[PDB]
């Protein structure tokens, strides 16, 4: 199963699970510089591609 993985398979499975998806976040202090959830959610979609 490991031997049939190549670069195009990794691009397909990572786009299915990561790209325009809402994450779950947990944080324990001092976390005043942890970014806002809107700025975290907009970091999941890219600008140029």
């Amino acid at each position: 199963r490991i031997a049939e993985v190549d670069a195009s398979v990794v691009r397909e499975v990572c786009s299915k699970y990561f790209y325009d998806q809402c994450p779950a976040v947990a944080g324990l202090g001092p976390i005043e510089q942890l970014p806002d959830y809107n700025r975290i959610r907009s970091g999941m979609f890219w600008l140029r591609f």
Binding site: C22, G29, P30, E32, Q33, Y37, N38, R41
Partner: protein, 79 residues
């Protein structure tokens, strides 16, 4: 020097949030909103409105006494 990690000191406070794609953008709108904007109107009506009533009474007395000082002459118009 006012950046986000350097503002203030805070302890023992927890916050919970939902994603914007997981909720509806319009919750209770006329069920909650109409009773909310009516007690906000009641809370400020005795402070804002009584000055503008006194402007209305001075405006009506000022335009009506302007005309019967000018050319409105029923009975003071003799020899």
């Amino acid at each position: 020097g006012r950046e986000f990690g350097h503002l203030t000191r805070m302890r023992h406070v927890i916050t919970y949030s939902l994603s914007p794609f997981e909720q509806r953008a319009f919750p209770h709108y006329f069920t909650k909103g109409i009773p909310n904007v009516l007690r906000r109107t009641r809370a400020c009506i005795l402070r804002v409105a009584p000055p503008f009533v006194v402007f209305y009474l001075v405006y009506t007395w000022g335009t009506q006494e302007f005309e019967k000082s000018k050319r409105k002459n029923p009975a003071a118009y003799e020899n």
